[PDB]
């Protein structure tokens, strides 16, 4: 026995963010058993087939595990058959389909059954004459078993993939796999709820405001990555609580009651966790960092207001329902469905081109906007995404990325460095992408978000970028105003006037570790000097962009970080004035 | 397989502590783990260059926690040796592998070269590969518990593994095993030599640690093996020329420094057999010519890259700061520490042939901590199935993933001539999408590059504005210090020059089972004409003169009258 | 047991006394196979392991196969033979995916089983080509 | 592969390695598909000298046609046999 392993008795309330799918599942496995006459009142057959699909660690196997735990209860015997990816292939080739039929025969025997096919794309790929005839004959056997001439019984077949297009398209048909449940990377409410689920039997709990900040800092985290975040925070808390048990092979005496997971343990875990949606590519887009928030927060707020006006993010009086069953419970019925048409008519052509100077923090603005759009499906049309395939063309990559935006809406087509992207993408590829955009309906919620440095209006009005309707959507990034520069540099003058006793230079233990038993002055800084260094620091950076201000700030932060121990900051101030002037 | 433990591994002590909390701490203290109700991580991907101790760490993990009470059962697979013709038998063999790993619950599975077992799944590839990746994904994290089975995978490139295999639950953590620094190469040489009869001193083993730059651990193991074999060939050569066993005594063979020099001659490391530049130190002959200029560069790199601070980011291991230091009773100070890096760029320009190939390598030797990514032409056009734009993007990606890193472009004047302009724009857009605090140094070395491609030309988007360093031609004093070794070789008496002298006897059987005349006014004359010849020379123009005069001097290496040698040297420089 | 697992039965009429012009590689090959079998007390004193791998490379008909066969018939004496396996990169089943891994694992199992062994791959670039090829 | 053929190869290889150096037994073997014999017997000390038997060229087909024609009661002139030689590029003796 593994006492620290995955627990099989997971209920449906240890799953966060998937509450529509739990209700939709419980009318396939439970409600035809309890109420057979309601389905008999119509002539309907219940949907007995569902394909779970989405990114890895989204809980697809967790929903099947919670379901198998639910069917392992009293008052309803439901046999569960768990199959891994192509374990049904026998040692020989004549018996593989004979195995698969045997599964269904046995599944028909216990008469309420569930077959879970985990990793079903490895069992039933798209039938190909150039592949292998056994991998098409197994698919044909499965197709004629889920619905041949005779009834397969009361057998619910569940599949699970992260590549559903690698399943044969005949299999995804009402009568085999009627429903397809998409398991998304969780949004902020669901990342909050998973972070509450993980830290709920903890001794000293996390506060709710801290779980809010953790849900904001984690993005692109699945449920697997959130559980890994909590595990690494708990392990870092153990190894700063009792570091002795790492240097001793024999067991020491340790109580896990002095171990409390603090906030900085979670911050150290967030420094080291790469989420699975960022391991293959580089990283995730991040919010606007805390140092440059004075320079760009006032422009980013105008952008965010324009973006949720244009995309109707803030209202959602129709969408974002946590479960439609609770909407039938908690909301009365009306007892003429063009009010839906007027509601979907509020999206005409989401375009946004953010133009600005050559160094004005466009990478920060683009990443912060891609964090603000949480439900959206970002497709990255940058040069580094198109040319990073020797195999695929950059005509097919543009088209496959647009069709990936179009298939799963809401979506963003994100083109950073558009002034570069014009010059190094060939002219007809820009014409090809424009064609895909006009093929869509005005109410399609596919945003085209572009960022550019010193891109004129002569390219937008009458040029290659004229077929994208960028006429009113032309947000200009200004350079930072003097109040923004003053608040930027006040955080640096605050570093000039810190006490050397208060910088977190953490000190060595002068004494040895409390060994476990085995078990069997003031700153000479005139405020006039502060005002003088602030005045020259401001009037040096007169009409600077964001990266020029970051250059000045990096140089002055170096000069201030040299004399970080000195109680006389008077050489530092004249050194800064010697530098800038 | 040999017995190993964690003390036969040098310089990977951060990862040994992370492995302890995943294989051995959950066995000892299960109540500490189920206090937070957290499952211990049981999947790690060891990745990096070859010969860096991935298999050694995987074996030491098994033989460390194994003891009297609990046995850790080790399972090793080679890279897709599980495959039969019918994929169903390979399914059954992976399934039986995980079932018998679960039967011995305390266990470890090692998948060596798991990119060969589990590539990225595709339909444009055989169904055996997608089938085995599907059953591997469902055996590592499926609907039932796999038991206390730790899955370890080794690979040289982690991005060729399927990405559903790189997520928490299966292969949760990824450890990059780097090529060792001076301290770890020192420790590896101590590990290899500690069972020797007569040991090496510390000064020579640190000389070896500095002489073996670019060596991985397999390189250092083969170096110590070849040095011991050369000492065997030197001591008792007779065993290489007899049919049967002779009698030798182990008391006589001791590995000397000259054996290590001969082994350093013939052992080639896996850095020196790659295609990019090799970060060697400045060679001892041209060090007087470029040491002064190179030193200025080390100050510039200390300034822009904050190499001399190391006051917040001293995290060798996360545990080791908990061992000696004390937890602080704002952490915006770390943002003002990260804020000292702004955009580390540096273009080293100079005249044609002015030792740029030495300076770039010496700078990459100075940045020991950094991940050097090479963008020279032979590194992009090396792989034949990989295009140039894709190669450049991949090079930037691996620099971005592992910071601090260098994006190194030698021969920049050739590079902007052959690389098409829409790859320079892709690289400029890649650098333009970086946060300012990101420590990715763009280090280009050029040869008679103008300033005009920097201000309003192709490299304007890269911002080499105030970061242009000029390698100038070496001074007259540098030239004097350079040619002093040449005249010191001229002043060497033929007694001092090492003749490979013959033997006076044969070797014993092993049974069965005057005045070197050189006046210092003549030396002053050859010095004065060597200086007068080399007026405004570059480094390579000086090395031509030094090579021709060293050829003339090595002609008469046994003469005791150095008159005609002097006359030939003054006849050449004319 | 059903694979290409047979030892190539060498003849004792091939030794280094029938090879011409390659004496450095013979002297380097004595310390690789012959001397660790003959003097295991000396390799253990430095705790060194000899190199278990060598690539013979050159134009055809220069004696790479002859050098391997003479290496097999060199220290095959004193009732202590060298079991010689010879494979080739030009086999029809060598590029047979699924089967070729089974044959290689069975070859290395049977070479570990007959303990002083030599595996000779006649055209190794047929078996292990560059993965970055076209 | 079957067991019984695999054991036939496993004994034919051991018999060929058992044959002495003073060569007095020679084993000739014929195939029309040479890379379908087992690879082991093509290794040194085994079936190692090969004779390729190509399709005939024009003079060879002339000689073959003469050989087939030889014993007819009414004869065939040599010019017609040469024309029939030039018309049959690709024709074995069968």
């Amino acid at each position: 026995l593994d006492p620290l392993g995955v627990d099989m008795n997971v209920n449906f309330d240890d799953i966060g963010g998937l509450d529509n799918y739990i209700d939709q599942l419980k009318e396939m496995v439970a409600l035809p058993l309890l109420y057979p006459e309601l389905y008999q009142n119509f002539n309907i057959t219940p949907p007995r087939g569902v394909l779970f699909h989405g990114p890895p660690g989204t809980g697809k196997t967790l929903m099947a595990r919670a379901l198998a735990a639910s069917c392992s209860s009293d008052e309803r015997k439901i046999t569960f058959f768990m199959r891994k990816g192509a374990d049904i292939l026998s040692k020989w080739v004549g018996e593989a389909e004979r195995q698969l039929r045997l599964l269904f025969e046995e599944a028909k025997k216990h008469q309420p059954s569930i077959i879970f096919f985990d990793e079903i794309d490895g069992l039933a790929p798209v039938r190909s004459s150039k592949q292998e005839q056994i991998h098409a004959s197994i698919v044909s056997t499965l197709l004629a078993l889920m619905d041949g001439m005779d009834n397969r019984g009361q057998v619910i077949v569940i599949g699970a993939t992260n590549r559903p297009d690698a399943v044969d398209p005949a299999l995804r048909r009402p009568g085999r796999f009627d429903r397809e449940f998409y398991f998304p990377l969780p949004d902020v409410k669901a990342r909050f709820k998973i972070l509450q689920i993980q830290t709920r039997k903890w001794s000293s709990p996390l506060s709710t405001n801290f779980i809010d900040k953790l849900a904001f800092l984690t993005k692109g985290y699945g449920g697997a990555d959130l559980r890994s975040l909590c595990t690494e925070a708990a392990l870092i808390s153990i190894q700063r609580s009792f570091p002795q048990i790492y240097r001793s092979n024999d067991k020491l005496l340790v109580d896990p009651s002095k171990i409390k997971v603090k906030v900085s343990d979670f911050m150290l875990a967030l420094k080291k966790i790469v989420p699975s949606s960022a391991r293959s590519t580089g990283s995730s887009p991040q919010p606007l960092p805390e140092l440059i928030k004075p320079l760009l927060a006032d422009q980013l707020n105008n952008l965010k207001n324009k973006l949720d006006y244009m995309l109707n993010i803030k209202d959602t009086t129709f969408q974002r329902n946590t479960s439609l069953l609770q909407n039938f419970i908690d909301y009365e019925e009306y007892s003429y469905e063009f009010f839906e048409s007027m509601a979907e008519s509020q999206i005409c052509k989401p375009r946004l081109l953010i133009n600005g100077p050559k160094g004005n923090g466009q990478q920060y603005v683009g990443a912060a906007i891609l964090n603000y759009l949480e439900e959206f499906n970002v497709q990255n049309l940058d040069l580094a995404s198109l040319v990073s395939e020797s195999s695929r063309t950059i005509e097919a990559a543009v088209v496959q990325s647009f069709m990936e935006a179009k298939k799963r809406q809401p979506s963003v087509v994100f083109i950073p460095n558009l002034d570069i992207w014009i010059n190094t993408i060939p002219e007809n590829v820009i014409l090809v992408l424009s064609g895909l955009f006009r093929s869509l309906q005005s109410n399609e919620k596919i945003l085209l978000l572009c960022l550019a440095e010193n891109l004129d209006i002569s390219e937008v009005k009458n040029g290659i970028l004229s077929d994208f309707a960028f006429d009113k959507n032309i947000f200009q990034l200004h350079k930072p105003s003097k109040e923004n520069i003053t608040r930027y540099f006040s955080n640096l003058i605050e570093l000039l006037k810190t006490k050397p006793s208060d910088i977190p230079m953490k000190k060595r233990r002068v004494k040895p570790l409390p060994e476990l038993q085995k078990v069997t002055k003031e700153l000479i800084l005139t405020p006039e000097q502060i005002k003088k260094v602030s005045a020259c620091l401001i009037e040096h950076c007169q009409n600077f962009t964001v990266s020029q201000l970051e250059d000045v700030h990096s140089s002055v932060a170096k000069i201030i970080w040299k004399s970080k121990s000195a109680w006389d900051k008077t050489g530092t101030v004249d050194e800064i004035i010697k530098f800038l002037s | 397989d040999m017995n190993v433990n964690f003390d036969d591994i040098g310089g990977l002590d951060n990862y040994i502590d992370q492995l302890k909390e995943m294989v051995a701490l959950p066995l000892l203290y299960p109540e500490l783990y189920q206090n937070f109700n957290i499952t211990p991580p049981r999947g790690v991907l060891f990745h990096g260059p070859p010969g860096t101790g991935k298999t050694l760490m995987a074996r030491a993990l098994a033989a460390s926690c194994s003891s009297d009470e609990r046995k850790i059962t080790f399972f090793m697979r080679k890279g897709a040796d599980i495959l039969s013709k019918w994929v169903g038998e390979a399914e059954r063999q992976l399934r039986l592998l995980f079932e018998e790993a679960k039967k011995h619950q305390p266990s470890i599975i090692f998948f060596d070269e798991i990119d060969g077992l589990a590539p990225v799944r595709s339909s444009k590839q055989e169904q055996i590969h997608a089938s085995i990746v599907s059953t591997l994904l469902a055996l590592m994290d499926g609907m039932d518990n796999r038991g206390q089975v730790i899955v370890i995978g080794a690979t040289n490139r982690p991005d060729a593994v399927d990405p559903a295999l790189r997520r928490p639950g299966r292969f949760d953590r990824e450890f990059y095993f780097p090529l060792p620094d001076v301290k770890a190469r020192f420790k590896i040489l101590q590990i290899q030599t500690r069972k020797w009869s007569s040991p090496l001193s510390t000064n020579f083993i640190d000389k070896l640690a500095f002489l073996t730059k670019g060596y991985g651990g397999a390189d250092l193991r083969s170096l110590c093996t070849e040095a011991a074999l050369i000492s065997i060939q030197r001591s008792f050569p007779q065993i290489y020329r007899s049919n049967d066993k002779l009698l030798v005594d182990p008391s006589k063979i001791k590995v000397k420094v000259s054996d290590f020099m001969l082994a350093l001659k013939k052992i080639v490391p896996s850095s020196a057999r790659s295609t990019g530049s090799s970060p060697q130190p400045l060679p001892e002959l041209i060090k007087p010519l470029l040491a002064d200029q190179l030193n200025n560069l080390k100050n510039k790199l200390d300034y822009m890259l904050n190499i001399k601070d190391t006051t917040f980011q001293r995290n060798t291991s996360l545990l080791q700061n908990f061992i000696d230091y004390e937890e602080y009773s704002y952490e915006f100070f770390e943002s003002m520490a990260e804020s000292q890096i702004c955009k580390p760029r540096l273009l080293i320009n100079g005249p044609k042939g002015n030792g740029q190939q030495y300076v770039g390598a010496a700078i990459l030797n100075y940045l020991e901590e950094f991940n050097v990514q090479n963008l020279d032409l032979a590194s992009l056009v090396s792989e034949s199935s990989r295009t140039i734009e894709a190669a450049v993007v991949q090079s930037f990606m691996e620099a971005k993933k592992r910071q601090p890193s260098v994006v190194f472009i030698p021969n920049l004047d050739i590079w902007i001539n052959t690389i098409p302009e829409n790859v320079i724009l892709v690289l400029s857009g890649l650098f333009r999408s970086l946060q300012s605090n990101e420590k990715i140094l763009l280090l280009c070395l050029a040869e008679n590059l103008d300033i005009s491609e920097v201000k309003n030309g192709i490299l304007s988007d890269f911002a080499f504005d105030k970061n242009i360093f000029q390698l100038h031609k070496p001074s007259k004093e540098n030239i004097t210090r350079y040619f002093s070794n040449l005249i010191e070789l001229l002043k060497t008496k033929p007694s001092d020059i090492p003749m490979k002298k013959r033997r006076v006897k044969p070797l014993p059987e092993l049974q069965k089972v005057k005045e070197l005349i050189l006046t210092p006014e003549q030396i002053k004359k050859v010095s004065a004409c060597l200086i007068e010849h080399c007026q405004n020379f570059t480094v390579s123009q000086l090395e031509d003169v030094h090579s021709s005069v060293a050829k003339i001097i090595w002609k008469s290496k046994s003469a005791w009258d150095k008159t005609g040698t002097v006359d030939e040297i003054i006849k050449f420089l004319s | 047991e059903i694979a290409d697992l047979d030892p190539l039965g060498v003849d004792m009429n091939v030794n280094f006394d029938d090879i011409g012009g390659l004496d450095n590689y013979i002297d380097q090959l004595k310390e690789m196979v012959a001397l660790p079998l003959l003097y295991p007390e000396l390799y253990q004193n430095f705790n060194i392991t000899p190199p278990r791998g060598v690539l013979f490379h050159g134009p055809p008909g220069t004696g790479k196969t002859l050098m391997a066969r003479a290496l097999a018939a060199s220290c095959s004496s004193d009732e202590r033979k060298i079991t010689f396996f010879m494979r080739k990169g030009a086999d029809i089943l060598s590029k047979w995916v699924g089967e070729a891994e089974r044959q290689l694992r069975l070859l290395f199992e049977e070479a570990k089983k007959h303990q002083p062994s030599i595996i000779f791959f006649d055209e190794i670039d047929g078996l292990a080509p560059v993965r970055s090829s076209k | 592969q079957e067991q019984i053929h695999a054991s036939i190869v496993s004994t034919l290889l051991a018999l060929m390695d058992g044959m002495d150096n003073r060569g007095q037994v020679i084993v000739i073997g014929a195939t029309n598909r040479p890379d379908a014999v087992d690879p082991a017997l093509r290794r040194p000390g085994r079936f190692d000298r090969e004779f390729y038997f190509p399709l005939p060229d024009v003079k060879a087909r002339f000689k073959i046609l003469q050989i087939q024609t030889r014993k007819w009661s009414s004869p065939l002139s040599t010019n017609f046999i040469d024309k029939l030689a030039f018309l049959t590029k690709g024709y074995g003796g069968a």
């Binding site: 040692k91 020989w92 080739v93 004549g94 292998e132 005839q133 056994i134 | 495959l83 039969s84 013709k85 019918w86 994929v87 169903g88 038998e89 055989e126 055996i128 | 047979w96 995916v97 699924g98 089967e99 | 079957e2 067991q3």
Partner: peptide, 15 residues
């Protein structure tokens, strides 16, 4: 190309 085979001939061998 990788596909598997029949469980081998029974070799009845009694008559």
């Amino acid at each position: 190309k990788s596909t598997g085979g029949k469980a081998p001939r029974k070799q009845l061998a009694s008559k």
